Design a protein around this ligand. Structure first.
Ligand SMILES: C[C@@H](N)[C@H]1CC[C@H](C(=O)Nc2ccncc2)CC1
Lengths: 20, 337
């Protein structure tokens, strides 16, 4: 499932802003 | 009456914008207790004001780290904007000051935690729960945008839950007052509008796209575009094919398709009718906008409160010393702070 795909991913923690 | 609220609100904002509050406390007035947050630059600590016994949350930025990250102008934006604004769902700046090494912004302490932490734990919010929060963001953006402010980093991580279950938006590190278009590549990968990824020159509409991302993530438990690495996320965004969970009501989907709209002539919030395109949507037909503003609606979730100064609704963080050099760093770069 999509939920399972997410939970197994590296981006379920707090996400940092980006910048160049 | 919304027009009239916002005109008076603009007059209030302008006085503070043109004449910012500056140097209204000192580090030694506070007892640092615990680090309750990191990023996107610096860190935020629970502190206690000796003279009142009040608790606050103090953001500290290292001026040298800000310079290295080319965040000088953004940091000046952040503090100049935050000191000027005033809306029920915006975290309040109580004091700001600086010393030889750091910049400090002491906000009100919002004990309830980040929305992110509750969303991840519970998994997803019900549509009514998500709509309650989404309405708050809609009105906050209505307010910021009327001031020519673009927020540029909406995500659950930045939304604090107060003791009454309502939101405070925190972290104005990328907020900017701009009338036309702007080009800086900033925000968080999952929440970027395609026009930012495509380096196009954009406006307040990026915030309405990001609202689309948020609502979806609150309702689904995951964001509409996710992958292990940001470039993979950007690819999914610029295709713009979004799949909704079968549990999403047909109204929710139709809201979201108009928010997660690559085409700026069709994306809600941007059009001739402005924010009413959102407010008068059928997903929002049960929403009492005036009652949301006045904090009269009953919150679907009220966080546990173990006492003043309790931090158990936040994660634990590595504690770093506050070093204050004997020599002034970056005096001229931060002179207006
Ligand atoms: C994830 C980052 N963009 C950032 C979100 C807001 C957070 C904060 O100010 N927290 C806070 C403020 C006031 N009271 C309690 C917590 C700091 C970390």
């Amino acid at each position: 499932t999509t939920y399972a795909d997410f939970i197994a991913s590296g981006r379920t923690g707090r996400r940092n802003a980006i910048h160049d | 009456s919304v027009k009239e609220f916002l005109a008076k609100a603009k007059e209030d904002f302008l006085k503070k914008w043109e004449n910012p509050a500056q140097n209204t406390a000192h580090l030694d007035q506070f007892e640092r207790i615990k680090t309750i947050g990191t990023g996107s630059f610096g860190r935020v600590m629970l502190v206690k004001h000796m003279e009142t016994g009040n608790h606050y949350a103090m953001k500290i930025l290292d001026k040298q780290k800000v310079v290295k990250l080319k965040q000088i102008e953004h940091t000046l934006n952040e503090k100049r904007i935050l000191q000027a604004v005033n809306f029920p769902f915006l975290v309040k700046l109580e004091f700001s000051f600086k010393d030889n090494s750091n910049l400090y912004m002491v906000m009100e302490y919002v004990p309830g935690g980040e929305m992110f932490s509750h969303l991840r734990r519970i998994g997803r919010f019900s549509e009514p729960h998500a709509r309650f929060y989404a309405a708050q963001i809609v009105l906050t953006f209505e307010y910021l945008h009327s001031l020519d402010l673009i927020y540029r980093d909406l995500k659950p991580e930045n939304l604090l839950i107060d003791q009454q279950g309502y939101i405070k938006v925190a972290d104005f590190g990328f907020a900017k007052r701009v009338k036309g278009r702007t080009w800086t590549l900033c925000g968080t990968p999952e929440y970027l509008a395609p026009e930012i990824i495509l380096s196009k020159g954009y406006n307040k509409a990026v915030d309405w796209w990001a609202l689309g991302v948020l609502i979806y993530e609150m309702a689904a438990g995951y964001p509409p575009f996710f992958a292990d690495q940001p470039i993979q996320i950007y690819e999914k965004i610029v295709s713009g094919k979004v799949r909704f969970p079968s549990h999403f009501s047909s109204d929710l989907k139709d809201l979201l398709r108009n928010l997660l709209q690559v085409d700026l002539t069709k994306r809600f919030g941007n059009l001739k009718n402005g924010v009413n395109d959102i407010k008068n949507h059928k997903w929002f037909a049960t929403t009492d906008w005036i009652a949301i503003y006045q904090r009269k609606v009953e919150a679907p979730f009220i966080p546990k409160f173990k006492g003043p100064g309790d931090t158990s609704n936040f994660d634990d963080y590595e504690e770093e010393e506050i070093r204050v050099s004997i020599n002034e760093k970056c005096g001229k770069e931060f002179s207006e702070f």
